[PDB]
Amino acid sequence: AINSGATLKDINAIPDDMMDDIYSYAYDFYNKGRIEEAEVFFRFLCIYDFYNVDYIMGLAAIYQIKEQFQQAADLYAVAFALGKNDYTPVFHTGQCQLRLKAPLKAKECFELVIQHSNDEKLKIKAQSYLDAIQDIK
Amino acid sequence: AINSGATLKDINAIPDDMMDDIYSYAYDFYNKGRIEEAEVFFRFLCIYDFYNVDYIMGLAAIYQIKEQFQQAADLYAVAFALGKNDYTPVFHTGQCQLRLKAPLKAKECFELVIQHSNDEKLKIKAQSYLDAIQDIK
C-alpha cells in the first residue's frame, strides 16, 4: 500500500522571502564560479515560477556558459516574449546563433537590437559585434 | 502570444549520474554546515524522485535542524513507510514529537524502536532517550 498517511505533506508552496533567498544563492553560485551548483537553483526556480524573466534569463545564461547553445537560445526566446521590449535576450540569442555557426540568424539578431533597443550600452555591444563579424568573416 | 517556439525545451529528465551528483552536493552543503543552501538541493531531489528513502531522510533531517519539527516528522513518517522495517525514521519522529512537547507520542516512538529494531546501536540510543525522559521528567 505505502499509502501516504495522516499527513501534510505539503504545501509545496514556497514563501516569497524564500523564493528570493533562493535566487540570491543562485546568483552567488553563479558569480563565485560554481556553475553546476547554480544550474540547480535556477532549474528549480524555473520549475516553480517559469514566467519570470529574471529566472529564465538566469537559466539561459547557464546553458550558454555550459556551451549548450541551442537550449540557451530557446530560453532567451521566452525571456524576450515576456520581455516588454527588453532586447537583452535578443542580443544573447545573437551570441548563441553565432556559436551554432549560423551567422545569418546571428546578424539579424544584432541588427534587430540596434533598430529597436533603448539600452544605449547594449546597442554599442550589438553594433560592435556586427562590425567584428565582417572584420574577418 | 509568447508561444514557446521551435524548441526542446526539455526534456526535464535528469541523467542518473547527475541526480547522484546532486545528492552529493546536498550532503556536502549539509555536512559543511551551509544549511539553507542544502535545503534546496534536497527539496529539489524530492520534487523529482519523491519515493526515495535517502532523499526524504535528507529533507526531513533539514526541517529538523531548522526547528520546523512538525514538517520533519511528517516526512519521517513516509521515510519509514517506504522503510522496509528500517526504524531510524521512527527514532527521529521521537526526537521531533519531544520538541513538539508531546512526550506521550515521543515515548511510544522510542518504545517501538526498542521492540522491533535490529539496529543494535539504534536500540541503545532509543533506550537511553527513554531513560533520560523519566530522569527529570
Residue numbers in the entry:
A (entry chain A), B (entry chain B): 18 to 154
Show passages lifted from the paper:
Within each TTSS a conserved, class II chaperone protein is required to prevent premature association of translocator proteins while maintaining them in a secretion competent state, ready to be presented in a temporal fashion to the TTSA. In the enteric pathogen Shigella flexneri, invasion plasmid gene (Ipg) C is the class II chaperone for invasion plasmid antigens (Ipa) B and C. Owing to this central role in supporting translocator function, IpgC is essential for Shigella virulence as an ipgC null strain is noninvasive. Furthermore, upon release of the IpaB and IpaC effectors, IpgC binds to the AraC-like transcription factor, MxiE to promote expression of late-effector genes. Two reports describing high-resolution crystal structures of two class II chaperones have provided a great deal of insight into the structure and function of these all alpha-helical, tetratricopeptide repeat (TPR) proteins.
